[PDB]
Design a binder for this molecule. Structure first.
Ligand SMILES: O=P(O)(O)O[C@H]1[C@@H](OP(=O)(O)O)[C@H](OP(=O)(O)O)[C@@H](OP(=O)(O)C(F)(F)P(=O)(O)O)[C@H](OP(=O)(O)O)[C@H]1OP(=O)(O)O
Ligand SMILES: [Cl-]
Ligand SMILES: [Cl-]
Ligand SMILES: [F-]
Ligand SMILES: [Mg+2]
Ligand SMILES: [Mg+2]
Ligand SMILES: [Mg+2]
Ligand SMILES: [Mg+2]
Length: 134
């Protein structure tokens, strides 16, 4: 069930999934609609779902990782697609081999150095590239 803010923007949550506390490598996943494109794992909040809970849940479903939830980075709007995303830090401590989106849609995941993550996000996902600007 999709949920919305009072202005009609779709509510989403995402994590910057870092390999370690040094925050030098981040995990991206392939797009479901376009599999040669990279995105930050995230998705819609469910009804009455805390943003931090949605963020951890979506990363588990899309990226097959668990870890230590850190800071809220910020709340980011995409004006073109009318959605508003709470973005958290997650320090990955568990990498599971066969996760919901790998099994169901063959979603891929890869570690990127921060500067390379920004590069691959810029063309189609400039707001997600901006998650890293802080
Ligand atoms: O993360 P979500 O908010 O679920 O985004 C999910 C959907 O949302 P929904 O599940 O249909 O509500 C996106 O559609 P909208 O951009 O919200 O229309 C999808 O966006 P699209 O409709 O393809 C787009 F934004 F118009 P494009 O990326 O083609 O410019 C998004 O696809 P991406 O993977 O490319 O972000 C999808 O992601 P996924 O299928 O990997 O979950
Ligand atoms: Cl790291
Ligand atoms: Cl976006
Ligand atoms: F989802
Ligand atoms: Mg979704
Ligand atoms: Mg998603
Ligand atoms: Mg999802
Ligand atoms: Mg979802």
């Amino acid at each position: 069930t999709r949920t919305y803010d009072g202005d009609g923007y779709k509510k989403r949550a995402a994590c910057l999934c870092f390999r370690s506390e040094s925050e030098e490598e981040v995990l991206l996943v392939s797009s479901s609609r376009h599999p040669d494109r990279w995105i930050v794992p995230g998705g819609g909040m469910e009804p009455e779902e805390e943003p931090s809970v949605a963020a951890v849940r979506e990363v588990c479903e899309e990226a097959g990782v668990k870890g230590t939830l850190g800071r809220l980075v910020g709340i980011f709007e995409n004006q073109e697609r009318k959605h508003r995303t709470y973005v958290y830090v997650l320090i990955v401590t568990e990498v599971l081999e066969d996760w919901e989106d790998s099994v169901n849609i063959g979603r891929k995941r890869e570690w990127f150095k921060i500067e390379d993550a920004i590069k691959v996000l810029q063309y189609h996902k400039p707001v997600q590239a901006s998650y890293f600007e802080t």
